């Protein structure tokens, strides 16, 4: 809940995104990974992480 919730600097986002990127290459999750990397511009990573 606390300790850098919605009010964080952008520089802290890479550390959190590292785990999601590691999970998204687990040999069987290729569908979502490809959909993400193809349409990143329209659906940026921040809102995906929030969802």
């Amino acid at each position: 809940p606390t300790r850098y919730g919605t009010s964080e600097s952008i520089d802290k986002f890479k550390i959190a995104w590292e785990n999601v990127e590691s999970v998204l290459n687990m040999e069987g999750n290729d569908f979502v990974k490809t959909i993400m990397y193809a349409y990143e511009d329209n659906f940026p990573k921040k809102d995906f992480y929030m969802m």
Partner: protein, 50 residues
């Protein structure tokens, strides 16, 4: 949910945090002083008469 992926994620997180916690900063800078080698006075010529 696949229970293998979360174990790998936890292992990676633990490795990262503990690697970041072993680094210690310790510098060995020397002083900005000098050495002050030996020296002697040099005399200048003069003239004398009486």
């Amino acid at each position: 949910p696949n229970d293998e992926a979360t174990i790998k994620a936890l292992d990676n997180v633990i490795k990262q945090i503990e690697a970041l916690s072993v680094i210690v900063n310790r510098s060995e800078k020397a002083d900005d002083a000098q050495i002050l080698g030996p020296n002697t006075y040099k005399q200048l010529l003069e003239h004398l008469f009486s």
